[PDB]
Amino acid sequence: QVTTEAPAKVVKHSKKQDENIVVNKFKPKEPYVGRCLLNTKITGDDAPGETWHMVFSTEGEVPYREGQSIGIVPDGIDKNGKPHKLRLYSIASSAIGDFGDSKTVSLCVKRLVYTNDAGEVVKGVCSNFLCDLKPGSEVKITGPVGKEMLMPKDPNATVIMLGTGTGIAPFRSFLWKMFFEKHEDYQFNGLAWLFLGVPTSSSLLYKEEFEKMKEKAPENFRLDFAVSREQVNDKGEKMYIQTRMAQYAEELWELLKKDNTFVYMCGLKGMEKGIDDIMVSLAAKDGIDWIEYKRTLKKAEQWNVEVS
Ligand SMILES: Cc1cc2nc3c(=O)[nH]c(=O)nc-3n(C[C@H](O)[C@H](O)[C@H](O)COP(=O)(O)OP(=O)(O)OC[C@H]3O[C@@H](n4cnc5c(N)ncnc54)[C@H](O)[C@@H]3O)c2cc1C
Ligand SMILES: NC(=O)c1ccc[n+]([C@@H]2O[C@H](COP(=O)([O-])OP(=O)(O)OC[C@H]3O[C@@H](n4cnc5c(N)ncnc54)[C@H](OP(=O)(O)O)[C@@H]3O)[C@@H](O)[C@H]2O)c1
């Protein structure tokens, strides 16, 4: 008698792709050092700000999956001569990545530039270090991190993705695995619906890639853009993400009542409110309380949010 089945730790059940998940392999103390392969500005010279797409080599050392983030420790020192603390960035590439070899990672970064009360033009430290990165230079990477935005296991589920600005990042990740990759254990056949809010047309992130996916899966891939400073509803209200969602109110509420519908939200902290406003009315007309229903969805792993 050399064996025994040690009693099992009690565990919560999950509908998301978390099997063999990895978080925090690399710490800021000793980050994984990768190199920049490419770094391109994806917004028009005319857009209010600049957003860049960049790819780093990982030689397969960073075991990330769709929906996770990695931290970046930007080169340099702060005002007190100390190294910079990490900044987190949602991964914009699928687990196998932009080279299809599982040896790279991609980011979608907005260059942060503003002016303080003193009237001084301030440049965000990490975002400017990243957007300035030249191919061939090293970059310190930490993580992976996160389990909230992991894709659902069900390959026939309805996945509603709501994002603003660079919040599109994890959705580009999900969608690559869903429509640009042939997976033995996962071949998506449900309905993927993406809503993306950006300020101008010169700011439409990954527009061409999304259009190729629609041209390849015209049935099960739906795409709706909400250009806030160019588009307007019938009353002249700015077309924010919730204003566009409102044109499909009947349909979305109908999908939300389905049990295989998963909603993901990523981007600005504020997008959260206008959407709940839209949802509270729908449930109300249906004799439902969104406050209680949302609670249920959240616990059922069907209302996933990652905003900052
Ligand atoms: C999980 C997670 C994922 C993220 N994913 C992404 C992503 O994919 N892409 C992305 O670009 N960002 C993402 N971010 C944000 C990112 O981590 C950084 O905060 C961002 O890049 C800015 O950092 P920085 O080092 O450039 O700026 P910092 O040097 O840290 O400066 C930021 C500070 O400047 C001030 N500030 C910022 N904006 C303004 C303003 N408009 N007016 C006045 N003061 C201001 C604030 O005090 C703020 O604390 C994510 C954040 C989290 C938590
Ligand atoms: N995992 C994460 O937590 C994660 C991942 C990626 C990005 N982010 C965060 O999300 C943000 C992305 O910012 P960005 O600079 O890329 O975006 P932005 O370009 O400044 O604007 C995004 C769009 O959303 C609109 N908007 C503003 N307030 C809104 C509101 N309350 N409800 C709905 N829409 C609203 C804006 O309209 P107007 O400009 O006309 O006002 C704009 O069209 C960053 O702050 C980043 O930190 C977080």
Distance 21 CA to ligand 1 centre (A): 27
Three-state secondary structure string covering the chain: CCCCCCCCCCCCCCCECCCCCCCCCECCCCCEEEEEEEEEECCCCCCCCCEEEEEEECCCCCCCCCCCEEEEECCCECCCCCECCCEEEEECCCCCCCCCCCCEEEEEEECCEEECCCCCEEECHHHHHHHHCCCCCEEEEEEEECCCCCCECCCCCEEEEEEEHHHHHHHHHHHHHHHHCCCCCCCCCCEEEEEEEECCHHHCCCHHHHHHHHHHCCCCEEEEEEECCCCECCCCCECCHHHHHHHHHHHHHHHHHCCCEEEEEEECCCHHHHHHHHHHHHHHHCCCCHHHHHHHHHHCCCEEEEEC
- C-alpha 114/C-alpha 91 separation (Å) is 25
- C-alpha 76/C-alpha 283 separation (Å) is 51
Distance 126 CA to ligand 1 centre (A): 8
Distance 227 CA to ligand 2 centre (A): 12
The residue nearest atom 29 of ligand 2, judged by CA position, is: 271
The residue nearest atom 17 of ligand 2, judged by CA position, is: 165
The residue nearest atom 28 of ligand 1, judged by CA position, is: 124
CB 270, CB 224: distance < 8 Å: no
Q: Which atom of ligand 1 is nearest to the CA of 306?
A: 1
CB 53, CB 106: distance < 8 Å: yes
Here the tokens at position 225 are: 């853009």
- C-alpha 295/C-alpha 156 separation (Å) is 24
CB 102, CB 63: distance < 8 Å: no
CB 91, CB 170: distance < 8 Å: yes
Query: Closest ligand to 146 CA?
Result: 1
- Residues in the chain, how many? 308
Domain ranges of the chain: 13-145, 146-308
- C-alpha 241/C-alpha 233 separation (Å) is 12
- The resolution in angstroms reads 1.8
Q: Experimentally, how was this structure solved?
A: X-ray
Ligand 1: which residues within 6 Å by Cβ?
69, 87-90, 108-110, 112, 114, 124-127, 166, 169, 308
Was domain 146-308 assigned CATH 3.30.1330.60?
no
- Angle subtended by helix axes 271-285 and 290-299, to nearest 10: 110
Q: Which atom of ligand 2 is nearest to the CA of 203?
A: 19
Query: Closest ligand to 205 CA?
Result: 2
Was domain 13-145 assigned CATH 2.160.10.10?
no
Pairing of strands 303-307, 261-267: parallel
CB 182, CB 189: distance < 8 Å: no
Here the tokens at position 248 are: 């499909």
CB 138, CB 293: distance < 8 Å: no
